[PDB]
Amino acid sequence: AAQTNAPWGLARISSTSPGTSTYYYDESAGQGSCVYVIDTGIEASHPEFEGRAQMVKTYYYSSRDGNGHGTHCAGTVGSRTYGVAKKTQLFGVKVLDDNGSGQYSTIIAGMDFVASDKNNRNCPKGVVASLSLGGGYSSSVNSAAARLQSSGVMVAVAAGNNNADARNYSPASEPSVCTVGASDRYDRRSSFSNYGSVLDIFGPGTDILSTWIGGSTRSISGTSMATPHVAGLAAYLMTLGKTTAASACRYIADTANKGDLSNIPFGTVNLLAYNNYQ
């Protein structure tokens, strides 16, 4: 399948080169997979989600996304126009308040929730969780992310936006999950992206158009935007049968575009997520 005039990041993930604008993907499109977006919520009524999104848990007075961040990330995973995996099922877990903040205890509870809740959902092709959030190093937060991964969920987490080594942030620094840095449309490391040996992969993160609350759209930047590209890619590849939740981060790194990014510090992987769709 081909989507013309796609957001640059979608085109990038199906291309061996920067500077194109058509996204190419197998029409299976993540059908039969599920992605949990653990964030500020999802505006499930947005037309872009087509009835494929739903809120399943909140820790606050409402499940509504009163911020937009979670809705944008969900859109990059799975919206019809802005998403990588255009037929996946999206499940929202609201661990962040409408200012984008949340306590680590709530975030941990949300990860353990997903590890169990997937047993209440129909995801025959596999389960992914996208975590566009983080703070300072916490062994308990890292352990929660490790448990979620161990339970059979492909966990993708943002590297963070400090232009620093991600070893000092969580869940970015957990070795067993997939830690995602950000790039721009000219194949440069995004100026804010964290780096370091704990990164597994880069995805598009500068100037990413996706869904927003109030039925709208906007372009924003962050490793929060790179992470759902990788989460949606994992769901897409799992639906194709090419990999599994336990192996998808390694598979994405194995099949990535290699050596194409600039301003990658010595010791950080130079790997850009790629669907290898022909």
Side-chain angles (χ1 to χ4, degrees):
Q3 177 191 349
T4 54
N5 300 292
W8 79 261
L10 299 191
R12 190 71 193 84
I13 69 156
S14 59
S15 187
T16 50
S17 291
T20 70
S21 59
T22 305
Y23 175 37
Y24 306 108
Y25 59 98
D26 187 275
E27 55 190 352
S28 60
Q31 195 144 236
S33 69
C34 304
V35 187
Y36 286 80
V37 179
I38 304 175
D39 208 290
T40 65
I42 308 175
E43 186 176 280
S45 67
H46 200 301
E48 278 283 316
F49 295 124
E50 311 181 294
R52 292 180 291 100
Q54 52 180 125
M55 289 304 298
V56 298
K57 181 64 176 177
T58 183
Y59 296 90
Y60 303 92
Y61 60 81
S62 180
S63 294
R64 167 182 171 264
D65 182 9
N67 182 279
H69 184 269
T71 291
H72 194 276
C73 295
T76 298
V77 177
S79 65
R80 67 192 182 184
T81 305
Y82 313 99
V84 174
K86 300 177 186 302
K87 296 181 191 166
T88 196
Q89 291 285 313
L90 296 162
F91 298 130
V93 179
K94 180 174 174 61
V95 301
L96 302 179
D97 70 19
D98 289 340
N99 296 321
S101 308
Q103 289 189 340
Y104 270 166
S105 51
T106 298
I107 292 162
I108 289 166
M111 288 194 258
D112 283 324
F113 172 86
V114 174
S116 182
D117 183 75
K118 69 180 193 289
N119 296 312
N120 293 320
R121 311 298 166 191
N122 286 299
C123 309
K125 300 298 186 190
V127 184
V128 181
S130 192
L131 284 144
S132 290
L133 57 76
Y137 179 87
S138 161
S139 62
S140 300
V141 171
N142 282 12
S143 287
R147 289 191 296 275
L148 179 56
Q149 176 70 51
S150 167
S151 84
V153 176
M154 189 291 175
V155 182
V157 311
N161 306 322
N162 318 90
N163 187 34
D165 197 308
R167 72 197 301 166
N168 288 315
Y169 299 91
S170 287
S173 61
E174 167 50 39
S176 67
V177 302
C178 206
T179 299
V180 183
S183 62
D184 77 13
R185 72 175 69 245
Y186 301 108
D187 284 351
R188 304 181 291 212
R189 181 172 65 91
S190 302
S191 59
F192 50 79
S193 186
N194 286 351
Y195 51 82
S197 63
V198 70
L199 269 65
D200 300 291
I201 193 65
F202 283 81
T206 299
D207 298 329
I208 305 304
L209 181 57
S210 191
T211 42
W212 200 253
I213 55 168
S216 70
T217 62
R218 63 179 61 185
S219 179
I220 58 166
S221 300
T223 60
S224 287
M225 286 60 260
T227 301
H229 283 89
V230 170
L233 175 62
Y236 166 87
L237 294 168
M238 294 154 74
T239 288
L240 285 174
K242 280 165 170 337
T243 190
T244 69
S247 51
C249 189
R250 199 176 290 213
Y251 181 87
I252 287 165
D254 290 345
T255 60
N257 283 308
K258 306 177 167 41
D260 297 318
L261 301 174
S262 64
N263 201 32
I264 300 294
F266 197 81
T268 295
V269 295
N270 195 328
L271 297 173
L272 179 65
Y274 174 50
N275 76 357
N276 198 23
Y277 176 66
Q278 279 94 35

